[PDB]
Amino acid sequence: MYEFKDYYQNTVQLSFDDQPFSDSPKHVWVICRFGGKWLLTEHEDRGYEFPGGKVEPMECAEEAALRAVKEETGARVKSLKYLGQYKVLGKEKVIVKNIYFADIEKLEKQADYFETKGPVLFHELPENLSRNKKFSFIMKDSVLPISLKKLKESGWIE
């Protein structure tokens, strides 16, 4: 279990156990890999980030993860694996996000990318994420390097 601060100095509680903070998380975050490259999305406001979204009515976290990937990158998932879960303690409300790993099979053409500029492919993520103004704040805290290390240790990536 990890406890640290996010980009906006809110307390973040991170764990790689099976849903320890909530069995009903309202949000999802999907770390995507298409072959040997990282599949990201470009949010119209935030910038470069891994696909994510809110759990919509009658959906489970896994279905919300598959939908977020399609809505933001137009991609189809070959294998969706649960990585971990995190809780953000803010001002208005606490948000529980489920972290998923998605092995991307293909990228299909989409008519509407929603509030995103479409799929973005990176051979490897840049070193200066926290200082990179083109990237989203959700990629600018420890959630990302810790989750990538656990993904590297799990043996799911190549």
Curated annotation (Swiss-Prot):
It catalyses: 8-oxo-dGTP + H2O = 8-oxo-dGMP + diphosphate + H(+). Keywords: Hydrolase, Magnesium, Metal-binding. The keyword Chloroplast does not apply. It comes from Bacillus subtilis (strain 168). It is an enzyme of class 3 (hydrolase). This is Putative 8-oxo-dGTP diphosphatase YtkD. The keyword Lipoprotein does not apply. Mg(2+) binds at A68, E72. A motif (Nudix box) lies at residues 53-74. Not induced by oxidative damage (following treatment with paraquat or hydrogen peroxide). Not induced by mitomycin C. Not induced by sigma-B general stress inducers such as sodium chloride, ethanol or heat. NCBIfam families: nudix_YtkD (TIGR02705). Its EC number is 3.6.1.55. InterPro entries: Nudix_hydrolase, NUDIX_hydrolase-like_dom_sf, NUDIX_hydrolase_CS, NUDIX_hydrolase_dom, Nudix_YtkD. One of its GO terms (molecular function) is 8-oxo-7,8-dihydrodeoxyguanosine triphosphate pyrophosphatase activity. Its cofactor is Mg(2+). According to PubMed:14761999, can complement an E.coli mutT mutant. According to PubMed:15576788, cannot complement an E.coli mutT mutant. Involved in the GO system responsible for removing an oxidatively damaged form of guanine (7,8-dihydro-8-oxoguanine, 8-oxo-dGTP) from DNA and the nucleotide pool. 8-oxo-dGTP is inserted opposite dA and dC residues of template DNA with almost equal efficiency thus leading to A.T to G.C transversions. Functions, in conjunction with MutT, to protect vegetatively growing cells from DNA-damaging agents such as H(2)O(2) or t-BHP (t-butylhydroperoxide). The 2 proteins do not however protect spores. PANTHER family: 7,8-DIHYDRO-8-OXOGUANINE TRIPHOSPHATASE, 8-OXO-DGTP DIPHOSPHATASE YTKD-RELATED. Belongs to the Nudix hydrolase family. It comes from the Bacteria. Optimum pH is 8.5-9. PROSITE patterns: NUDIX, NUDIX_BOX.
